[PDB]
Write an enzyme that holds these catalytic residues in place. Structure first.
Site, PDB file in Angstrom:
ATOM      1  N   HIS A  78     -55.477  34.053  39.510  1.00 52.20           N
ATOM      2  CA  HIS A  78     -54.850  32.731  39.753  1.00 52.20           C
ATOM      3  C   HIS A  78     -53.517  32.639  39.019  1.00 52.20           C
ATOM      4  O   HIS A  78     -53.276  31.696  38.276  1.00 52.20           O
ATOM      5  CB  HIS A  78     -55.805  31.618  39.367  1.00 52.20           C
ATOM      6  N   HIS A 135     -50.367  35.103  43.248  1.00 54.08           N
ATOM      7  CA  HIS A 135     -51.288  34.387  44.172  1.00 54.08           C
ATOM      8  C   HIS A 135     -50.566  33.215  44.846  1.00 54.08           C
ATOM      9  O   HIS A 135     -50.652  33.041  46.097  1.00 54.08           O
ATOM     10  CB  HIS A 135     -52.504  33.885  43.402  1.00 54.08           C
ATOM     11  N   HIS A 185     -50.242  25.213  44.396  1.00 54.04           N
ATOM     12  CA  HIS A 185     -51.651  24.784  44.601  1.00 54.04           C
ATOM     13  C   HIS A 185     -52.562  25.172  43.427  1.00 54.04           C
ATOM     14  O   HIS A 185     -53.650  24.578  43.316  1.00 54.04           O
ATOM     15  CB  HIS A 185     -52.183  25.264  45.940  1.00 54.04           C
ATOM     16  N   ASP A 186     -52.227  26.184  42.637  1.00 58.85           N
ATOM     17  CA  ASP A 186     -53.064  26.554  41.456  1.00 58.85           C
ATOM     18  C   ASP A 186     -52.261  26.431  40.149  1.00 58.85           C
ATOM     19  O   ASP A 186     -52.583  27.144  39.162  1.00 58.85           O
ATOM     20  CB  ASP A 186     -53.625  27.969  41.578  1.00 58.85           C
ATOM     21  N   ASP A 241     -55.355  30.218  51.232  1.00 54.33           N
ATOM     22  CA  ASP A 241     -55.924  30.459  49.887  1.00 54.33           C
ATOM     23  C   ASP A 241     -56.815  31.691  49.871  1.00 54.33           C
ATOM     24  O   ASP A 241     -56.852  32.398  48.811  1.00 54.33           O
ATOM     25  CB  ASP A 241     -56.697  29.247  49.426  1.00 54.33           C
ATOM     26  N   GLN A 276     -69.862  40.244  48.877  1.00 58.67           N
ATOM     27  CA  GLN A 276     -68.668  40.164  49.784  1.00 58.67           C
ATOM     28  C   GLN A 276     -69.146  39.830  51.203  1.00 58.67           C
ATOM     29  O   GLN A 276     -68.612  38.847  51.784  1.00 58.67           O
ATOM     30  CB  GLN A 276     -67.777  41.408  49.663  1.00 58.67           C
TER      31      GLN A 276
END
Ligand SMILES: Cn1ncc(Cl)c1C(=O)Nc1ccc2[nH]c(-c3ccccc3)nc2c1
Ligand SMILES: [Mg+2]
Ligand SMILES: [Zn+2]
Length: 314
Positions: free
Chosen positions: A69, A73, A107-108, A218, A270
């Site tokens: 993050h 990113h 956004h982060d 995202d 995953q």
């Protein structure tokens, strides 16, 4: 400005248009890549170059040195939005094109490498200030803080009205990145699409569609070529396992996703993620915005690679 067209080397000029573009390991080119995308996506006129550069550099400063993050990113998620926007030219308002690349870059903001859950169990002050979508309300707060720095108001030319509209696109876009909210958002979009009630003139519908785009951008590591996907997963787990370490320190067995001792079960984890989140996300996105189909195709390719990992074919 304003005859100052940002240009990238030929391979980047071409591949940046593709959904699967990787922004590369040269941190110092990422601001230029972002400005390039804003100029092509929005116009050379949408932002004052000086202000935009100053905003980008303060956003960068307010991302932390965490494995996943981080600033890369941010720019990666902005590029996926750039590809969606460029493949759906005529569907989006002038304010949306402005707001959405910015929302993605921000956004982060100031992420610490920990989930909303961890903040809540730790009893972090942010969990008392924001009882749901804890980090996402923080990320929006950090975005407004930076917009209010001297010389950082990239929205200066907008009216009072348009400024409130664009900050509301950003706020909703950033809140939507809380994956807890994705499941219901996509369910409602899937029901709406199939009963034919989906109406892009309904603001409340547009909001949902932009939410799903945010989730799609995202999660876009799952839409890259396999070596990108695989090496990004390592960063994702580096955070998850550090969080699990911190859960153990509070006297809490973490979920297996965050327990480094259950490394062996990553490939199956995953599969669940691709099946429960990723594939459904890009499928519903492809239904609503047919030209985003390459994201679904790339996701399915990576699903098939994780299935090979389990079969020891890698
Ligand atoms: C790829 N990606 N992008 C954004 C995000 Cl969130 C991700 C992601 O990895 N999500 C994810 C989601 C659920 C998972 N569960 C496990 C797991 C379960 C049991 C044992 C070992 C592991 N791993 C998981 C990884
Ligand atoms: Mg986030
Ligand atoms: Zn993110």
């Amino acid at each position: 400005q304003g005859l100052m067209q940002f240009t990238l080397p030929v391979r980047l000029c071409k591949e940046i248009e593709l959904f699967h573009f990787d922004i590369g390991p040269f941190e110092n080119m990422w601001p230029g890549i972002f400005v390039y995308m804003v100029h092509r996506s929005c116009g050379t006129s949408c932002f004052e170059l000086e202000k935009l550069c100053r905003f980008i550099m303060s956003v960068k400063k307010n991302y932390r040195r965490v494995p996943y993050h981080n600033w890369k990113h941010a720019v990666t998620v902005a590029h996926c939005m750039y590809a969606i926007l460029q493949n759906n030219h005529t569907l989006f308002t002038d304010l949306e094109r402005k707001g959405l690349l910015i929302a993605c870059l921000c956004h982060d903001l100031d992420h610490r490498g920990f989930s909303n859950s961890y903040l809540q169990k730790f009893d972090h002050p942010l969990a008392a200030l924001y009882s749901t979508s804890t980090m996402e309300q923080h990320h929006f707060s950090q975005t407004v803080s930076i917009l209010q720095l001297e010389g950082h108001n990239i929205f200066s030319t907008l009216s009072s009205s348009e400024y409130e509209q664009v900050l509301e696109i950003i706020r909703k876009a950033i809140i939507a990145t809380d994956l807890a909210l994705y499941f219901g958002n996509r369910k409602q979009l899937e029901e709406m699409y199939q009963t034919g009630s989906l109406n892009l003139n309904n603001q409340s519908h547009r909001d949902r569609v932009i939410g799903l785009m945010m989730t799609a951008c995202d999660l876009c590591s799952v839409t890259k070529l396999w070596p990108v996907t695989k090496l990004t997963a390592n960063d994702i787990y580096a955070e998850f396992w550090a969080e699990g370490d911190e859960m153990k320190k509070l006297g809490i067995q973490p979920i297996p996703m965050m327990d480094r001792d259950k490394k062996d079960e990553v490939p199956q984890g995953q599969l669940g993620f691709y099946n429960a989140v990723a594939i459904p996300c890009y499928t519903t996105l492809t239904q609503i915005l047919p030209p985003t189909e390459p994201l679904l195709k790339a996701c399915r390719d990576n699903l098939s690679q994780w299935e090979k990992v389990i079969r020891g074919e890698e």
